[PDB]
Coordinates of C-alpha atoms (C1' of nucleotides) in Angstrom, one line a residue:
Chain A
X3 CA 58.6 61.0 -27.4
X4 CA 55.4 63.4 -28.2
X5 CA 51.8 62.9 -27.3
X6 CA 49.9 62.4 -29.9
X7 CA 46.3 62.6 -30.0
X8 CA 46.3 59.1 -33.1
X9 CA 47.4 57.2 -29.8
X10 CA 45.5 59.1 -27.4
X11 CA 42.0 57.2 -28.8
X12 CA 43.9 54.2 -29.1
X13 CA 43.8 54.3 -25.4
X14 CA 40.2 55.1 -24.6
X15 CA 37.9 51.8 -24.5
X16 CA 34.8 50.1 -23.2
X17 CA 35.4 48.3 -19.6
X18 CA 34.3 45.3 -19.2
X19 CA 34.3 43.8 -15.5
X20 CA 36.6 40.8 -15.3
X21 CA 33.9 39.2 -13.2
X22 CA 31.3 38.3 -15.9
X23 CA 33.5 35.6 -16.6
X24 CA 34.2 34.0 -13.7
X25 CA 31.1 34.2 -11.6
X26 CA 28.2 31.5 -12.4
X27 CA 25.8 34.5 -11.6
X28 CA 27.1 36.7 -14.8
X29 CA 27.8 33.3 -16.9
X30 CA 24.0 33.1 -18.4
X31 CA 25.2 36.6 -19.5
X32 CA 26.1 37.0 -23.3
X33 CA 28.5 38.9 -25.5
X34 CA 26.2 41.2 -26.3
X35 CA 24.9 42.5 -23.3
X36 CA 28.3 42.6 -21.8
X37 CA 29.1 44.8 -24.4
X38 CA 26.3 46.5 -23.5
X39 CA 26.9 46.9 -19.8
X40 CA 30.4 48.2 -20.8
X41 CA 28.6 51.1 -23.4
X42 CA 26.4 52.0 -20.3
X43 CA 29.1 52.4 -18.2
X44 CA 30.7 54.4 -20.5
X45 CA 27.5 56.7 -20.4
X46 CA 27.8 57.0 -16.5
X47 CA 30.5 59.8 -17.2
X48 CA 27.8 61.4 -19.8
X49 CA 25.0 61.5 -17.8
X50 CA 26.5 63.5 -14.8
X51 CA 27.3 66.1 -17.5
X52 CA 23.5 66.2 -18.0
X53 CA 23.3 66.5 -14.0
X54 CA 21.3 63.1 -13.9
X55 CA 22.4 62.4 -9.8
X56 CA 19.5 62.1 -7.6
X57 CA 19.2 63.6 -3.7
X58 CA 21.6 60.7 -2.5
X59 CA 23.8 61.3 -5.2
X60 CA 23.2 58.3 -7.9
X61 CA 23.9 58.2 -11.6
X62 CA 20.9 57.3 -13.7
X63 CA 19.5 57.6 -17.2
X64 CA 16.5 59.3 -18.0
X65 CA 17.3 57.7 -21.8
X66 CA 14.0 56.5 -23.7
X67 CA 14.4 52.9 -25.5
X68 CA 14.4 54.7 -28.7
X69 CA 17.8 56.9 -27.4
X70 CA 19.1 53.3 -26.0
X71 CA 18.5 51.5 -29.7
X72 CA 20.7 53.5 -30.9
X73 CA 23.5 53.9 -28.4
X74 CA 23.7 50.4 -28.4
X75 CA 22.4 49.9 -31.6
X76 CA 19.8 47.2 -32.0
X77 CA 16.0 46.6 -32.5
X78 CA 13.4 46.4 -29.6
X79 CA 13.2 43.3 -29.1
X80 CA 17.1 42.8 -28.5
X81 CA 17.4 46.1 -26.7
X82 CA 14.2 44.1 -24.3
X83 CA 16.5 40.8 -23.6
X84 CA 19.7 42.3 -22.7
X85 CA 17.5 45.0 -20.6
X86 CA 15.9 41.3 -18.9
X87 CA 18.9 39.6 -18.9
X88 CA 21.2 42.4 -16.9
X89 CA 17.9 43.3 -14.6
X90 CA 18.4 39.8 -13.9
X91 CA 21.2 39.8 -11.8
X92 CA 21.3 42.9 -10.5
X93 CA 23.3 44.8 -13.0
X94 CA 20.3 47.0 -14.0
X95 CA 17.2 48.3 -12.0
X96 CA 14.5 50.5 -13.6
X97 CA 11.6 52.1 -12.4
X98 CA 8.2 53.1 -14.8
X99 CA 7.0 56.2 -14.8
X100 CA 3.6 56.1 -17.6
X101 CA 2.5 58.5 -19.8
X102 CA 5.5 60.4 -21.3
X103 CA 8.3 61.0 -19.1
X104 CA 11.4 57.8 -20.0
X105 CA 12.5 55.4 -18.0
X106 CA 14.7 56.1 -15.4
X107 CA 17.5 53.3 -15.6
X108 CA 19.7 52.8 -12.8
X109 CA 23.3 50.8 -14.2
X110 CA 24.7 49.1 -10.9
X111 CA 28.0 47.6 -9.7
X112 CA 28.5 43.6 -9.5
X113 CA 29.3 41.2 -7.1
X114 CA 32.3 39.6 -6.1
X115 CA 32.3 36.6 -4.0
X116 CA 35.6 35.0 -3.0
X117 CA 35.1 32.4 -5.4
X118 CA 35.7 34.6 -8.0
X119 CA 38.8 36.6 -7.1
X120 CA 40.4 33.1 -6.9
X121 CA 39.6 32.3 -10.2
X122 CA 40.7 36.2 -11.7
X123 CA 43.7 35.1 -10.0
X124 CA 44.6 32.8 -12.8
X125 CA 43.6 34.6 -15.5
X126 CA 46.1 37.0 -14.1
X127 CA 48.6 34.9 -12.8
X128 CA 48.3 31.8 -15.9
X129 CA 52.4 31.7 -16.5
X130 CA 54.1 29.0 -18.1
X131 CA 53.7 26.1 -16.1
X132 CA 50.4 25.1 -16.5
Chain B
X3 CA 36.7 55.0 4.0
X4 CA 38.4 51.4 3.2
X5 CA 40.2 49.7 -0.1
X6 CA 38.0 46.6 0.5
X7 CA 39.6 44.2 -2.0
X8 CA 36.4 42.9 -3.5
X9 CA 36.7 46.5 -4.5
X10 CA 39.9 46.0 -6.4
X11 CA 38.8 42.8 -8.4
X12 CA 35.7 45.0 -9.6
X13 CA 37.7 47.4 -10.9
X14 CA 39.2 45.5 -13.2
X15 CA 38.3 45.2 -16.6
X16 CA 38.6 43.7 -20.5
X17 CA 39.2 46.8 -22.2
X18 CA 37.6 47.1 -25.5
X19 CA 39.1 50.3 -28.2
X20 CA 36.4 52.6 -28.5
X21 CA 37.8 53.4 -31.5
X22 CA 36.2 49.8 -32.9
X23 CA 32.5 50.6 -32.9
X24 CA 33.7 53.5 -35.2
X25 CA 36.0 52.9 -38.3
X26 CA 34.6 51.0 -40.9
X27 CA 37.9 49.1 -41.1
X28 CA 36.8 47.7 -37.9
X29 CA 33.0 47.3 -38.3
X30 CA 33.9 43.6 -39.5
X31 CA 34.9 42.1 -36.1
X32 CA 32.1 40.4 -34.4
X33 CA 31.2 40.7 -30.6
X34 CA 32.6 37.5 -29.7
X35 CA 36.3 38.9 -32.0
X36 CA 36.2 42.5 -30.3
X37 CA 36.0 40.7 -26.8
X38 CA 38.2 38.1 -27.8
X39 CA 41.2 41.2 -29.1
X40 CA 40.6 42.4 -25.3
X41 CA 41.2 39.2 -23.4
X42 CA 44.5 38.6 -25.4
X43 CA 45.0 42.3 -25.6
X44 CA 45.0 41.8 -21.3
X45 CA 47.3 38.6 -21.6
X46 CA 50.0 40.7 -22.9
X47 CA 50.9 41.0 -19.0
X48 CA 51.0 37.8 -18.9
X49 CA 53.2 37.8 -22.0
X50 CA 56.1 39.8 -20.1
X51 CA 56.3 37.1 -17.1
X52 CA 56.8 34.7 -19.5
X53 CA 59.7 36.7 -21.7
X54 CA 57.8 36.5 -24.5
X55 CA 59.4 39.3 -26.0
X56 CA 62.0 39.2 -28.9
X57 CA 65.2 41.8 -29.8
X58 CA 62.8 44.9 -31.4
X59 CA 61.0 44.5 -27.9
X60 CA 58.1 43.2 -29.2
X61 CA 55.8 40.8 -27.1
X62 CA 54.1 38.0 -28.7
X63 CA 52.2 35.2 -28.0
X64 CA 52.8 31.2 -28.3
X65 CA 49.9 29.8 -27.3
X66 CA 48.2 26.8 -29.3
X67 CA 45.1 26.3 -30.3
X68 CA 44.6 24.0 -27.0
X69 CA 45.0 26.8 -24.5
X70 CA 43.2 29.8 -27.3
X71 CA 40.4 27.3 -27.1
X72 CA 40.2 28.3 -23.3
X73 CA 41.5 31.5 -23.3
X74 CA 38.4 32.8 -25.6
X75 CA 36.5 29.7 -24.5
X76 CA 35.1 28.6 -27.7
X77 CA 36.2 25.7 -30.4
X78 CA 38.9 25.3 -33.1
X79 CA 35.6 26.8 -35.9
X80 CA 35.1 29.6 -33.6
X81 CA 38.7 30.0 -32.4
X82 CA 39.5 30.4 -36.4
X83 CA 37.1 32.3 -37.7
X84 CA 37.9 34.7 -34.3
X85 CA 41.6 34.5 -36.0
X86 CA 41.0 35.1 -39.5
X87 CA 38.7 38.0 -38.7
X88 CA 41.2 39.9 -36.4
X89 CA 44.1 39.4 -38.8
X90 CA 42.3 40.0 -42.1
X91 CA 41.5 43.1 -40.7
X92 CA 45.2 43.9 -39.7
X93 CA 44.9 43.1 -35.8
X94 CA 46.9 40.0 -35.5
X95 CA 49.5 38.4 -37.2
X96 CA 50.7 34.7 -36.7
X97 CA 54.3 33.4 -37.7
X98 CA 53.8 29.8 -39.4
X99 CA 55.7 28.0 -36.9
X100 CA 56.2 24.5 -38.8
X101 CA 57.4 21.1 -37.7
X102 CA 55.5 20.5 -34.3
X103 CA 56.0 23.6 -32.4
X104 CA 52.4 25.9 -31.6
X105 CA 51.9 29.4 -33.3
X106 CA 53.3 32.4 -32.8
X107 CA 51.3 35.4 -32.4
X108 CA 52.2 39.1 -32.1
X109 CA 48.7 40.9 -31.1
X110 CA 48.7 44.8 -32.7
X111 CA 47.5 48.4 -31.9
X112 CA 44.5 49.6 -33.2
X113 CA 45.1 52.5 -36.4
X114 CA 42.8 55.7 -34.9
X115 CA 42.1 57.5 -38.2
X116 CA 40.7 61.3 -38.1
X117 CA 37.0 60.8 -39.0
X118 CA 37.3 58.0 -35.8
X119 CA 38.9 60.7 -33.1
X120 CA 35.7 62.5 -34.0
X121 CA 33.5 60.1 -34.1
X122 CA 34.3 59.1 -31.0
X123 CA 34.9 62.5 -29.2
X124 CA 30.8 63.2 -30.5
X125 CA 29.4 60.5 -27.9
X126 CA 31.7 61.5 -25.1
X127 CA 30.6 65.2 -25.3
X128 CA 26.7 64.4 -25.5
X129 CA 25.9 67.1 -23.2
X130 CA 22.1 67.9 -23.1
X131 CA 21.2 70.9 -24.5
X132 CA 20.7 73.5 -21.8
Chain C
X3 CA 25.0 49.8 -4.3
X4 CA 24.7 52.1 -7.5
X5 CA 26.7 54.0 -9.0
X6 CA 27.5 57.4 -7.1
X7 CA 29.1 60.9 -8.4
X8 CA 31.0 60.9 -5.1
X9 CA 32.8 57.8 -5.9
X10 CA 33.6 58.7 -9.6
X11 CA 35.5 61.7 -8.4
X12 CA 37.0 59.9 -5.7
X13 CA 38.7 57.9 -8.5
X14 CA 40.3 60.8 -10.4
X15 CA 43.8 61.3 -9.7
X16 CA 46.7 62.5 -11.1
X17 CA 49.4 60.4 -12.8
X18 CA 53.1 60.5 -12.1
X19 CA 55.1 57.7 -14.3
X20 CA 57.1 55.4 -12.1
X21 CA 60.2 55.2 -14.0
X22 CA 60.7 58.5 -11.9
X23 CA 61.4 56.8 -9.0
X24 CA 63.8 54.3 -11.0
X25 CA 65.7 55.7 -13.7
X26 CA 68.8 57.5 -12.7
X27 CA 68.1 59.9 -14.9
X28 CA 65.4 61.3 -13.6
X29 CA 67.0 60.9 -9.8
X30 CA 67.7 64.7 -10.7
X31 CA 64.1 65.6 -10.2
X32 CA 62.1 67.2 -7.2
X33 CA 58.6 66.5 -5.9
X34 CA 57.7 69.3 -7.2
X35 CA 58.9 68.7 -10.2
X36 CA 57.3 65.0 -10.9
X37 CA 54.2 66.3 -9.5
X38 CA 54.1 69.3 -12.0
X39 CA 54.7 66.5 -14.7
X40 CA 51.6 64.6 -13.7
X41 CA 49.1 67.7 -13.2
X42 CA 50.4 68.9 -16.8
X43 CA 50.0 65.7 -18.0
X44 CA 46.0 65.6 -16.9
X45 CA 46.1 68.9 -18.9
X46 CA 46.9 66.8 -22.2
X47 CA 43.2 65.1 -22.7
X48 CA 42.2 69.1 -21.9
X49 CA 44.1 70.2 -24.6
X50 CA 42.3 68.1 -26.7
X51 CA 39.6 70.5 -26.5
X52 CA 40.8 73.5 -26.9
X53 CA 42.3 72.1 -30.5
X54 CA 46.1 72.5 -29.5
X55 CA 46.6 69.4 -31.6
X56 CA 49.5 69.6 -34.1
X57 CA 49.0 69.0 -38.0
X58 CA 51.5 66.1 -36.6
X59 CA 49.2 64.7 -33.6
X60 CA 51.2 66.2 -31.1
X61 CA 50.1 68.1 -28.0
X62 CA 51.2 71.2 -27.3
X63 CA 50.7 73.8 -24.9
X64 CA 49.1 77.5 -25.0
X65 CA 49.8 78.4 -21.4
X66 CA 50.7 81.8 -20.1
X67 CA 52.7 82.1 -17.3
X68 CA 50.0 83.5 -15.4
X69 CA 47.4 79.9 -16.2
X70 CA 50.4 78.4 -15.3
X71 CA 51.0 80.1 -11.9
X72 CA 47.6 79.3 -11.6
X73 CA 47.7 75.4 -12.7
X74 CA 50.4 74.3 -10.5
X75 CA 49.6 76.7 -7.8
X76 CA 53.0 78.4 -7.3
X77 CA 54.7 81.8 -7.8
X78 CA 56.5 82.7 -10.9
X79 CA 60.2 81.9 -9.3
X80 CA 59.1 78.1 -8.3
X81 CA 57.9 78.1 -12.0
X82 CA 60.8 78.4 -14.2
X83 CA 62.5 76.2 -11.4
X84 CA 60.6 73.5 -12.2
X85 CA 60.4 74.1 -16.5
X86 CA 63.9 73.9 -16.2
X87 CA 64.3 70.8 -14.3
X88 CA 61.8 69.2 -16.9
X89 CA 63.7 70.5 -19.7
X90 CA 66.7 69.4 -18.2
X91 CA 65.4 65.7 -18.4
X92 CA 63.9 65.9 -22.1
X93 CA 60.4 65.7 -20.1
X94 CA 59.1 68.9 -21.8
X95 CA 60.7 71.0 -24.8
X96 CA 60.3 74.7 -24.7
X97 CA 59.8 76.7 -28.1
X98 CA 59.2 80.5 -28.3
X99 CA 56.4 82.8 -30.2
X100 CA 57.5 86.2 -29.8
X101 CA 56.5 89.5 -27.6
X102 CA 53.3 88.9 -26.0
X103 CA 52.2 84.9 -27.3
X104 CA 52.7 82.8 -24.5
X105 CA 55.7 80.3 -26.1
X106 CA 54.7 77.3 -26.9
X107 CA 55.2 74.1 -24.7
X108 CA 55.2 70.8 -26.0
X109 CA 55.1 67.5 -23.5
X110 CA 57.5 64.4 -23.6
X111 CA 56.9 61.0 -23.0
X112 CA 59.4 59.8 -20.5
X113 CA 62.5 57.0 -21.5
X114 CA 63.3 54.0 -20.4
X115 CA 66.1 51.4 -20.3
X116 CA 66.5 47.7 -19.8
X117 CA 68.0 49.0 -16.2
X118 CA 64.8 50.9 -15.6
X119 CA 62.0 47.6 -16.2
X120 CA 64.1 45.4 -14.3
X121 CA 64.2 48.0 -11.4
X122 CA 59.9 48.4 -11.9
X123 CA 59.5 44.7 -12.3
X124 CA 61.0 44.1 -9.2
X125 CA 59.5 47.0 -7.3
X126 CA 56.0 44.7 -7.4
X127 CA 57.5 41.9 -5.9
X128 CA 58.2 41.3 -2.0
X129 CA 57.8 38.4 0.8
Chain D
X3 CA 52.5 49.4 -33.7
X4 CA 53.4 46.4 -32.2
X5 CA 53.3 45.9 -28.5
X6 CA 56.7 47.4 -26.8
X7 CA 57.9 46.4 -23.5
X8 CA 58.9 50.3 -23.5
X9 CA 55.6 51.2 -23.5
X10 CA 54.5 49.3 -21.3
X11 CA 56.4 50.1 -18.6
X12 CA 56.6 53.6 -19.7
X13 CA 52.7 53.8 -18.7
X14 CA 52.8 53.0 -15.3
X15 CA 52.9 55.3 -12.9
X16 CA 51.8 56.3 -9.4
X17 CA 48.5 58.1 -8.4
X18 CA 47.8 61.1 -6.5
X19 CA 44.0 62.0 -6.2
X20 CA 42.9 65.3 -7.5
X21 CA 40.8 66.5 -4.3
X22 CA 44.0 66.7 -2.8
X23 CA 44.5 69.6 -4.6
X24 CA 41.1 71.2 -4.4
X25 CA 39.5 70.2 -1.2
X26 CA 40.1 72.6 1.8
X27 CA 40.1 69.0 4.2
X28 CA 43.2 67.9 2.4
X29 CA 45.1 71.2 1.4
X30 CA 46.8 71.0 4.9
X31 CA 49.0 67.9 2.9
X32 CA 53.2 69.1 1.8
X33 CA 53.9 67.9 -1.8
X34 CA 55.9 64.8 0.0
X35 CA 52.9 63.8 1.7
X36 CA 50.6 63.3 -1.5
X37 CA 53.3 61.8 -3.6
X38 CA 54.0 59.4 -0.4
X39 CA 50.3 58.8 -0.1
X40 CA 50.3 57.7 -4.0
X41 CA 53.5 55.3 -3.2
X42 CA 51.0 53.2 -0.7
X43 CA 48.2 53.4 -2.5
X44 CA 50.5 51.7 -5.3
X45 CA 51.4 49.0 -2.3
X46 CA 48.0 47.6 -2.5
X47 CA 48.5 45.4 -5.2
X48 CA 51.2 43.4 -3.1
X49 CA 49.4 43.9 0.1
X50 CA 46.6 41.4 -1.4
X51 CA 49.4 39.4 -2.8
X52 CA 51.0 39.2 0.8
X53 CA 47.9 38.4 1.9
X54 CA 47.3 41.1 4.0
X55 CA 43.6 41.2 3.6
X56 CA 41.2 41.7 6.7
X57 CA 38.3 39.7 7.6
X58 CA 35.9 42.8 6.5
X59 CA 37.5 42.7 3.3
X60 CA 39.6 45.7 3.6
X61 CA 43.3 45.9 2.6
X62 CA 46.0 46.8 5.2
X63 CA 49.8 47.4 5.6
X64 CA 52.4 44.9 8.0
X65 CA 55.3 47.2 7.5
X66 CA 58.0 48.5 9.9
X67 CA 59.0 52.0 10.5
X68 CA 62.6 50.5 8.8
X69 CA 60.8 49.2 5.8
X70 CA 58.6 51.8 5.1
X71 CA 62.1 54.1 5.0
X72 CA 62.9 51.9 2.5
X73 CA 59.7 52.4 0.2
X74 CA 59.3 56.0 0.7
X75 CA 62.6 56.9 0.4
X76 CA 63.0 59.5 3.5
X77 CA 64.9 59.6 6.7
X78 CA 63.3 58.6 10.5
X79 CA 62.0 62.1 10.8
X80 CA 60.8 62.7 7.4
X81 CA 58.7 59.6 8.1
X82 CA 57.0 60.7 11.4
X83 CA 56.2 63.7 10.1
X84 CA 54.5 62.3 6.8
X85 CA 52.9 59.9 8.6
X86 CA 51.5 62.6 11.0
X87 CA 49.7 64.8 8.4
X88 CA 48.3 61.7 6.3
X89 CA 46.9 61.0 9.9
X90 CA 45.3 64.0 11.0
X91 CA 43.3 64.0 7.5
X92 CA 42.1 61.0 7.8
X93 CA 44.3 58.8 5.1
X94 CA 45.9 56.5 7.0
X95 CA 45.2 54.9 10.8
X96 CA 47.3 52.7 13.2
X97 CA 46.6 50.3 15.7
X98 CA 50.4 50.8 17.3
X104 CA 54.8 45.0 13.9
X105 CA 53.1 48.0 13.2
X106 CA 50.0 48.0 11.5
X107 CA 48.2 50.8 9.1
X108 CA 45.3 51.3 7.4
X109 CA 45.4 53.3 3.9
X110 CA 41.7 54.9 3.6
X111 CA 40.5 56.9 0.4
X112 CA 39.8 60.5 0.4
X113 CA 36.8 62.3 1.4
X114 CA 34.8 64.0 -1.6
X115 CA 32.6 66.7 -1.1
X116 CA 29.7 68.6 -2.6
X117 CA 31.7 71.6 -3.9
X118 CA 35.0 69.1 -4.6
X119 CA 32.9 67.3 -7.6
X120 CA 31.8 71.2 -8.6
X121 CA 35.4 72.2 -8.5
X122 CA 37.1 69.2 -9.9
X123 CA 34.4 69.3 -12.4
X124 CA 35.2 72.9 -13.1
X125 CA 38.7 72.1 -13.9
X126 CA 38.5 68.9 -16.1
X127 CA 35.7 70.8 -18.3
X128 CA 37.9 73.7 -17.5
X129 CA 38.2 75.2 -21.1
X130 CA 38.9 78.3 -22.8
X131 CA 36.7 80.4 -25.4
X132 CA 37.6 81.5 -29.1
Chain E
dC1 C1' 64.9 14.8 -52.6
dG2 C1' 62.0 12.8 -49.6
dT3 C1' 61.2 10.6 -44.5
dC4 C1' 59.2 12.5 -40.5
dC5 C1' 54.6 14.4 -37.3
dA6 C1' 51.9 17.6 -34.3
dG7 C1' 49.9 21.5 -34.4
dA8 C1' 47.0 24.8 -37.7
dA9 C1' 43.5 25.4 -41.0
dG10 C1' 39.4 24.3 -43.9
dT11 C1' 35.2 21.0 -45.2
dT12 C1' 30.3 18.4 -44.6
dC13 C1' 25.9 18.4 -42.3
dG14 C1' 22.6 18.0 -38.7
dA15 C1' 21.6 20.5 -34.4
dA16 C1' 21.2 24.9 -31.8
dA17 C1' 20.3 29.4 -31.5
dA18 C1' 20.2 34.6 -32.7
dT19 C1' 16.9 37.9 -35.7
dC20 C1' 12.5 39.9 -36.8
dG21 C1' 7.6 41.2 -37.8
dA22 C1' 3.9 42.0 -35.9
dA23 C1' 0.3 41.5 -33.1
dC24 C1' -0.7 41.0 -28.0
dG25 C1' -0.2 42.2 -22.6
dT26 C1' 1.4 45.6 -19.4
dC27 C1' 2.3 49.3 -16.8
dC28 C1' 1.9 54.1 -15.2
dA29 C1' -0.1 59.0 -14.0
dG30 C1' -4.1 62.1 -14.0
dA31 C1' -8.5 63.5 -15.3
dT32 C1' -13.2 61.2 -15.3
Chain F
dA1 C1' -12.1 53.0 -8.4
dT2 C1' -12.3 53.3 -13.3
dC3 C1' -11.0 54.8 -18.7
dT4 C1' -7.1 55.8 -21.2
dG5 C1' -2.6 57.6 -23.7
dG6 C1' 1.7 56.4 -25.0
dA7 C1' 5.5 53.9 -23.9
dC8 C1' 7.4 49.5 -22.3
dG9 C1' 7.5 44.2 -22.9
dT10 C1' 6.1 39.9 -24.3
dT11 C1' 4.9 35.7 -26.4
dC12 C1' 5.7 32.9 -31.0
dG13 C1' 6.9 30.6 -34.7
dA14 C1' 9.8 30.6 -39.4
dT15 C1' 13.8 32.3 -41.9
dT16 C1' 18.5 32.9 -41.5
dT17 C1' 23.2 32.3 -39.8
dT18 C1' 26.2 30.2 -36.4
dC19 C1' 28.5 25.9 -33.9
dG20 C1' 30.2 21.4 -33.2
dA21 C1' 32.7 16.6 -33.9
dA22 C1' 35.4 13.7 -36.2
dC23 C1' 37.6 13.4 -40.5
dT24 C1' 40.7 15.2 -43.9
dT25 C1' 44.4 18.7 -45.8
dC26 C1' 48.1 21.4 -45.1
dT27 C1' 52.2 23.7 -43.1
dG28 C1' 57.2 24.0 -41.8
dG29 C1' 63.0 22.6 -41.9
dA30 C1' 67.0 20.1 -40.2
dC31 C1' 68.6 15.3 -41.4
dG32 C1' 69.6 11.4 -43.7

DNA sequence: CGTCCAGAAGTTCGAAAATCGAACGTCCAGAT
DNA sequence: ATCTGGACGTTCGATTTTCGAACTTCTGGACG
């Protein structure tokens, strides 16, 4: 049948690595900062359009808190603990910079141990008998 | 140049409809409901090994509250407020299976509307001004 | 690791439905003509953009046969070959505009049968 | 609205990598190359499930010039021949039953520029 | 017209935790 | 090294809403 654009945004979404709920690392990790994670992700396309890809070629965000408040749409002090809680685990690494130039934020890839592919593997593969 | 296969598991995700973040018809759902739509929304897979599909080739779900309490990890409160929520807002609907036999469920598509594929297509052509 | 540009790229490819392979329907088409299918497929989420969208939410088309040429990389003999095998198949519908407008060319999702997921289905299983 | 098996199954498909089509390393690749390419990199999920993972963590192929006939869908010579140009760019190694290795493509500096040139690739009023 | 019963929904209240304001602590150049 | 600007973050309770456990209410439809 035809392509329609209604369906085309019913297929566009916000990953959200599989991972975060299997590994003890990303379990102290909440709903709202995987959410979060996923939004920033989302981003990564975004910024290389802005041209944001250092010397050895890295995606990053030059986004002040203020931008980041509203992207994922919070207050300051929520925006701090998901910021905390990701850099926490290696999800996120940021670097200062003073005066007036904005962060530079660094989103990163997780971990996968062997541990955790085996337990993806059931949330894949959870058929009828239990 | 490898396909290391801890690669493969991280690129696998919860997909989460932009599109919900955008309409107002949406903006009830919670962060623990939107997630909650994806990891069912993922279990239709899942949903095919088991046959759980009827004569209009629809698949459904017939899970009871015992395994949705794992599934979405959470408690019958949670698990029906996370129920309630989706289908009062026309994302799930449930067929009162009586007598002693679980609850069927037939998870839905998301209705894109225009002022959503614009809303949308705004973020994802943020281009800084140049 | 971060997140690198190289590695984004790396993972954009072009999409060629697998009931191609299955349905005997489409046992009819060439290489080049599933391939053509995929790259013109890409084009869709490009088409977007240009505001070819239909007052219906279809996706249409505004292609000479020179950006064509051009898209699939071909001469204007291969071309037609290939609309034609595609048309042949209900994959892509042809409609007209005149003299010098570039017809119209709107995309179709493919079809498939009981036969067809069964074929699939088993196609991602083996010892 | 609902969720249709149709649909389902009508949205999986195989993948062929753009830079393929734009990178001067891999234009030297026939049409029945890329497409055959696509078909292995579509093994992968059964290669894990066969458990033909390596110590390193890297996915590999235990097939047989009489299976892989089978998958691709081409003749003995066909074969050799497909399996000689995904060789010589670097998509696909042996250690000569017989054992491959499926590798992703090489991007360069001007393949982002010219992939990105086509994606964003628009056309004004 | 009831006799069945397990799985689903919907109550009550203490315990747990997310939200927020607003002041405080901190970091980073670059000019002193 | 030492001020210092503006932007990042932090510690802290009190107001507000969420969450949980065991109990209770309710929902089917063939069969006596």
């Amino acid at each position: 049948q035809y392509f329609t654009v209604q369906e085309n945004y019913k297929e566009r979404f916000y990953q959200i690595p599989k991972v975060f709920f299997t590994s003890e690392n990303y379990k102290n990790l909440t709903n709202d900062m995987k959410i979060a994670y996923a939004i920033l992700r989302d981003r990564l396309n975004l910024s290389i359009k802005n041209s944001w890809v250092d010397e050895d070629g890295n995606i990053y965000f030059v986004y002040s808190n203020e931008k980041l408040m509203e992207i994922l749409n919070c207050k300051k002090e929520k925006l701090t603990k998901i910021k905390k809680g990701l850099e926490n685990d290696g999800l996120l690494i940021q670097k200062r910079r003073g005066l007036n130039k904005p962060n530079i934020l660094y989103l990163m890839k997780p971990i996968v141990t062997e541990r955790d592919i085996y337990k993806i593997e059931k949330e894949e593969n959870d058929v009828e008998p239990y």
